[PDB]
Ligand SMILES: C/C(=C\COP(=O)(O)OP(=O)(O)O)CN
């Protein structure tokens with residue numbers, strides 16, 4: 384059975400920075416380090432940081448006075464930031480810079496009293512954080528997930544309207560939402576394309592190339608990872624069987640019995656060791672040497688704040 388590896392796969396720049404922020408804060412200050420939300424949506428990373436002294440919380444009122452608190456890579460609302468500011472806490476922010484860029488646009492529209500539309504999935508912490516940059520009751524902030532949601536939305540002043548997106552969406556489905564937005568609200572203003580980041584675009588292009596060759600695609604990522612679920616969904620929609628798995632122990636032998644080509648990728652929050660263990664298990668199940676596909680080079684790095692060097 385041939386094993387193919389998608390490229391790119393695995394950690395993006397924001398995740399690598401965010402994890403380093405939590406590790407370096409543990410090495411500098413010691414345990415406990417409080418983190419608002421799973422730093423990244425990966426069970427393997429979160430469980431090991433928890434064992435090393437990180438405590439993951441959702442609400443700032445779970446954090447004791449005098450603590451160190453780090454906001455997760457997905458970002459937080461201004462209400463969460465200001466609640467931490469008013470409390471007796473040392474705060475470090477692991478928000479990815481490509482999330483922060485979206486936040487600043489939502490904050491500008493709020494100041495102006497002008498309405499914004501976010502394209503994203505309700506309940507996800509990045510969506511709560513970005514909708515949480517808007518606070519002017521004269522304007523408005525609306526969430527749409529689909530073209531059907533666009534076709535139901537009314538706004539107060541469609542001549543002064545803008546849109547933003549979650550960073551980790553399906554590139555194809557988001558194009559369909561934007562095309563609805565522009566039909567319904569011809570004067571709406573946005574970026575040239577969307578706010579989907581380079582890592583999400585590149586991992587989706589890579590799993591498209593992988594699924595063209597492979598019968599079955601395994602995506603290493605946790606169930607609560609939006610970007611990882613997009614990779615499994617893409618391969619499924621191409622008619623391939625695709626499974627989102629935490630680790631090699633999740634692989635059921637039926638999924639790959641008598642399969643000639645199996646593909647493996649990883650979401651932006653999954654460490655490489657988990658892919659290397661998946662490959663070793665597929666080799667037990669009859670696969671040969673893993674073959675990496677040719678892929679788009681990534682070259683972006685985000686550095687940790689100098690306070691955590
Ligand atoms: C931090 C982040 C993405 C990194 O992957 P993740 O932690 O799995 O998160 P998501 O659920 O894909 O947003 C949102 N930009």
Ligand code: SF4
Nearest residue numbers: 395397479481550580
């Ligand atoms: S998936 Fe994109 S926006 Fe999110 S942490 Fe990674 S680089 Fe940043």
